[PDB]
């Protein structure tokens, strides 16, 4: 299968035609996506198979072929870019200044950008091109708009 670093669509042929259920990141031989995209199922890459290696429903993250490799963090001050990969559409960068999710366990950056559910797993990057988290787990605020957490895993 294709092991080149970069952003990938996650597709299924179980439903009508070929449907994009999410997106993920290949980095250092490991595939990274949100748990709600794959539900922890195995994935195909050409004739090859990717097996889950680590996952956590509460963090809403999963890694395949090895442990979670992404460890960059939002600096709390600068604009970032969502590398949105929408269903049936070309990868596109969107720059934004994150907001904050304040929780009883600390604060997390959040991006107020609304894309189709199949865009879940798209990477959020800093100015060095490092992935600071994945887009697609968030909340719907008063005015009906979507705000995603910048969800990042731990590199053991």
């Amino acid at each position: 299968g294709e092991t080149t670093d970069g952003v990938y669509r996650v597709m299924t042929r179980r439903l009508l035609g070929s449907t994009q259920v999410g997106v993920g990141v290949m980095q250092e031989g490991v595939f990274h996506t949100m748990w709600h995209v794959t539900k922890g199922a195995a994935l195909r890459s050409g004739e090859g198979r990717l097996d889950p290696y680590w996952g956590d429903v509460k963090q809403d993250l999963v890694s395949y072929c090895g442990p979670w490799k992404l460890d960059a963090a939002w600096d709390g001050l600068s604009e970032v870019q969502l590398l949105a990969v929408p269903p049936g559409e070309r990868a596109k960068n969107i720059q934004t200044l994150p907001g904050i999710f304040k929780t009883k366990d600390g604060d997390i950056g959040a991006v107020a950008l609304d894309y189709p559910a199949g865009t879940s797993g798209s990477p959020i990057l800093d100015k060095c091109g490092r992935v600071i988290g994945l887009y697609g787990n968030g909340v719907v605020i008063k005015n009906g708009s979507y705000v995603s957490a910048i969800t990042q895993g731990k590199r053991e």
């Binding site: 294709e2 080149t4 670093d5 970069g6 952003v7 990938y8 669509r9 996650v10 597709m11 299924t12 042929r13 997106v23 993920g24 990141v25 980095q27 595939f31 748990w35 709600h36 195995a42 994935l43 195909r44 890459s45 990717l50 429903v57 509460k58 963090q59 809403d60 604009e79 870019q81 590398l83 990969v85 070309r90 990868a91 960068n93 969107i94 720059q95 934004t96 200044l97 994150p98 907001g99 904050i100 999710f101 304040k102 929780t103 009883k104 959040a110 991006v111 107020a112 950008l113 990057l125 800093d126 060095c128 091109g129 992935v131 787990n137 968030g138 909340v139 605020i141 705000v147 957490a149």
Partner: protein, 39 residues
């Protein structure tokens, strides 16, 4: 059966479209990984 297809490189784009606001929200995260607003 799920499969992956490459969509691009991961790089910062100079002069990308700039949008979105920056809301500061009080939220709760449950055991199922669902975020909710605390009001």
């Amino acid at each position: 059966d799920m499969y992956i297809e490459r969509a691009g490189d991961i790089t910062w784009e100079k002069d990308a479209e700039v949008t979105g606001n920056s809301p500061r929200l009080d939220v709760a995260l449950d055991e199922s990984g669902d975020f909710s607003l605390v009001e």
